[PDB]
């Protein structure tokens, strides 16, 4: 029993080809219907528009399809800002990462998956970060 959350990295490695192993492990990780934040989808849209220069229509179609079928969005907790400031005193991370962990934690998530953000490090003794591609 555990609540799995994920970050922009898993979706980005899922989409790209040149990293066949990373893309694979990402697509199996998407099979367990892992929960997502609204933030993570927002940076997904941003990186698709900046890095991948995809047109708006296709991007919105893909995000709607994934939110409907593969990934399960989670509500934007209203205490995200105070709690993100709480981890700011004890943790050394980029503020966007602090928000994604804040919203994952406030939604009862136990395990988060990504390359970055200090593999294997438990956050406020209630959430863990696991690099799954290794």
């Amino acid at each position: 029993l555990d609540k799995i959350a994920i970050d922009t990295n898993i979706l980005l490695y899922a989409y790209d080809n040149r990293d066949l192993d990373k893309q694979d492990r990402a697509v199996e990780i998407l099979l367990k219907k892992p929960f997502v934040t609204q933030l993570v989808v927002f940076e997904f849209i941003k990186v698709l528009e900046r890095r991948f220069k995809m047109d708006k229509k296709e991007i919105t179609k893909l995000t709607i399809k994934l939110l409907k079928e593969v990934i399960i969005p989670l509500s934007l907790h209203r205490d995200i800002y105070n709690y993100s400031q709480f981890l700011l005193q004890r943790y050394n991370f980029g503020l966007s990462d602090i928000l994604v962990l804040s919203d994952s934690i406030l939604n009862n998530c136990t395990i988060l998956l990504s390359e970055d953000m200090c593999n294997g490090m438990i956050v406020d003794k209630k959430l863990k970060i696991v690099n799954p591609f290794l």
Binding site: R78, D79, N82, Y83, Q85, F86
Partner: protein
Amino acid sequence: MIKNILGLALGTNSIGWALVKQDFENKQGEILGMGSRIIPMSQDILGDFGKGNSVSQTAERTKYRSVRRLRERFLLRRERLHRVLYILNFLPEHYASQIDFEKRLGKFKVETEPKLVWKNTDGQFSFLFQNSFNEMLEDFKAAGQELKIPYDWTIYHLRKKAISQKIEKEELAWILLNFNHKRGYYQLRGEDFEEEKDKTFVRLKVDRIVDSGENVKGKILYDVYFENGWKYDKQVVKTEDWVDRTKEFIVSESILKNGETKRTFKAVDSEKDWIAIKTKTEQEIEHSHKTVGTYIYETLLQNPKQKIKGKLVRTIERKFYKEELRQILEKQKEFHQELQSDDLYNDCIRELYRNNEVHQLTLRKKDFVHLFMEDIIFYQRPLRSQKSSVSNCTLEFRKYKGENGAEHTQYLKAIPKSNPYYQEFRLWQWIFNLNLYTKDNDENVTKVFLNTTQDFENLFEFLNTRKEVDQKALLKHFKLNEKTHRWNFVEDKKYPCNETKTMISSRLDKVENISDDFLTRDIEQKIWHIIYSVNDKVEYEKALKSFARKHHLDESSFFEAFRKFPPFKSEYGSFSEKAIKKLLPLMRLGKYWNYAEIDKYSRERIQKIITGEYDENIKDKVREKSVHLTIENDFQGLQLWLAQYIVYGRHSEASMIGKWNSANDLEVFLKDFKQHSLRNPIVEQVITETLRVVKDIWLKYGNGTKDFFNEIHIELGDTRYISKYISGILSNIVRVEDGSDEGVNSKNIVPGNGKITTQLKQDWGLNDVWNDLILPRFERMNQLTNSKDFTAWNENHQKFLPTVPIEFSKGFSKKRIDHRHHALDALVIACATTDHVNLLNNQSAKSDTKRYDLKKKLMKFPKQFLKPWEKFTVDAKHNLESIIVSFKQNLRVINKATNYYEKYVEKDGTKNKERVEQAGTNWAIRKPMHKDTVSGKVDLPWVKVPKGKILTATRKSLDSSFDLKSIGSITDTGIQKILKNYLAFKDGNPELAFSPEGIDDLNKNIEKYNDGKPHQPINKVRVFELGSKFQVGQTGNKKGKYVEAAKGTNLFFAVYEDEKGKRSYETIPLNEVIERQKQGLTSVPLENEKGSRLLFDLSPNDLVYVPEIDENIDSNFVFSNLNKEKISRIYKVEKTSGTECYFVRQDIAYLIKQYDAKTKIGELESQNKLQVTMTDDRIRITDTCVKINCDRLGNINFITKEKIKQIFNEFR
């Protein structure tokens, strides 16, 4: 001509502040500001501090802390017992399996509750000591009582058996833990009293009462005789309750000097007085002549239904347990070789004190018995040193530079008064203070018998040999007698005469076998230091024997001389030892005086004085007084004043006067204020809040500039403590530095009295503005009671006056039922000039003309006072009908606390005991989390339980208040049946049925009401209740404890709104507030489960505006045009529960009539607070109220454009 006036009225929890800008000469002026600050606490404290009953939350916190600390010390004792016994291989395998000995030293493994004897195998519990159980059954069979007894009764059989037989090691470990449970009463000081110490609880019978011929108060007093031949020391009047009455007394007998017992008496009641119970149980144990364990075992043998814990043995001297445990250990010692193996003993010593090799070296010389008894179980820590709290000398200082590069001053602790230095000082001071008078002419007969130095020499030598003198001895020293002379002191009073040295002389005289010169200054001061420092019996006798060895005296009578020295009283002088030692030479005269013993600085100052030259450290008043000090020899017999100045150069304490220049000085003074520096917390809170309020008004109205307050008027209206302290503190701001204003208080500080304020309020029509303001409340009560007794018409004024019926006039005052009476008082005080207070305090003139000018200047022609300005009264109306009352709040839920603890740290290759700070985070809860009573959850098939609620059952005493409805609320059905039968049998009268006699009768005849079936007796029953109770904790058995929220802990009330518009309410209890604030979040969730956005949170003492039924307040703001209809619709939260919030109009202090369940009437119904408005619309406040925010001065605070700029101007 224009003067700024700050008037302050000080109450128990109220500060009334007013600031006005007056021209008395031109008959003008206007009020700038008014307000009242209220510190909420219940009227219980108000009625309690007048008499005094633990009126401090600090004391309650201290009590909880002490109880906890005792608990952890018991735990630590048991913990060390586990460690030692595990080393000894004494704990059983099944038990010791579930104790951690590696990380948590000796603690039970988490989520386990092992018992030493109850072994669990495949989910079943079995006893471990079967053979001892069978032996105890055989003993009971020999006694012939039963054959079915509890297994856990074996402990007393073993404790008796341990005295003279061999028991297995497991029972010994069990017995040791039991002894750790029950330690016993013990006094740390001890000091075994008179050898007889009779103190014997006896039961005596009064034989006869012979009328003693002592006719007092129209009645002749009788004496009392007893069967043993004893007479009651006191007499008796009431014959009926003394004839042949089996009375039990506590008596003390002392062998008097005549050689007879001086017997005392004291009536005492068993089972109701702790001393009587203790003595009776102690005597029952001794008269049995056996250990208390065997006494308990025998009493359980004879009466197997006996309650031991709390009934049979409650409290007995620690000596009993000590002797029993000693006998047990010694008699088990010769059988168990494990108690002699010194290898194991060293192993235990190393385990228990690995970081203290000194203590190991100490206890390596002892054995197991001393380690178990004196070290682990019966180890009582000594009292903490209060020496660091001793006061400081006002003259001697010391300066030093720390690691921070600053120069800060240490302090010199004051001299103990028992020190012979201070003794000689007080004797010299008195000797200079003494002067004789004659009885005949009451003339100053001095300068004849004590004029030359030799007379004072003989006087001092005489006074050294005694300890305290009287009229007689001081007169007879000079040969004078009672009939002709008096000594200028209280004729029948005794004054200290160096008790220390004289009593030392007596004890050194009784020892004998010594030369009559061994008592000198060095020896006396030494033995004083020994007898002052070591206040502990064994240490004290060691020290005395060592002194008798080092100094060539026999240690056979000297220790007997000094073993029963009564310890010194705890008192200290005003000065320190250095200051007294420096001062002593100058008060000296004759042979005890010499110039050589005066230090360099004072000798230099003496040379400067005699030479007549000019120094900056010497004032003109000095030579004015020291004109007679021409020669250095004149520095003989100098008193305290002159010598003190010459030593330290200051004309005693002349104070610093002081002058604050801005609000920064005040705020620094407030920052540096120390807790517990005054009489009691109430006045301290009042003074601190007054200082905060005056700082705020200074900032708001004068912006912290110099001398913005032209004058401050102060008044109070027990509480007199703050009458002078606040005036002294606030004198700094309104003082004048020109030299005209010199004294303890600034001349601008003008306290008044009740006479002035009441005469003014009558003469100004202020009473009229007040009663006009309050009348609507009385009209509301009239319409509520449907009468006309709450308002009285008058024709002299032609209007309705507030009034109360006589039956509701128990303690009424019209003035105490509002909060802005404080503002009224402040305003009337402010306008009262020094002329007014002088006129009304010194009305006695001795001549009409002299005070007639004040009459013409102040009285209307002496009828009424003339207006400060023509618009005074209506302006006062406008001001007072426009006051917001500001209520201080205490929403402390969590705060940070720092923990220091002793521990051995490795530094520079050495283990040193130093103080470590706790790692990690740890919060302190600042509110009582829940109520003390603990209930347990039950499930009853015959009770229907609503969803979301549970049934909790608690034990209660079966007593007179158990009627049929309540009898139906006991969880036990058979008990319900039996109690129903009994209550029916007593005609349905619980008072007769459930009296203690009735309970006894039911217990004796339980067959008659159980349908003939046997049943155990009943004294307490578990009554169940249906409601919402939450678990105390989650660990161990704390998940089975169900409690209720504590008083005053429903502190936040959330109001949310959904998208359409309805308001939803929630009462958020303290628990989730705690973990929310611990997670850094807001106190209340910002959305509810439905997702409705949170409007806001309400707390007790909050303020809301309740708009009219027609107004639509959605984005109103505009809180600057607060007129009277706006301000009358301001409600303060009072309490909260569920979805209900109760409010009181902010201007209400006390309800005219509270609520009584008989008449069923009240100002605000039963709760004394309404969920709705008091006005005729009666609208739910919670559905339309809007939260507001006020400051200390009660001014509304709202978003503005400057504020919206500054929000992120600060971050820019």
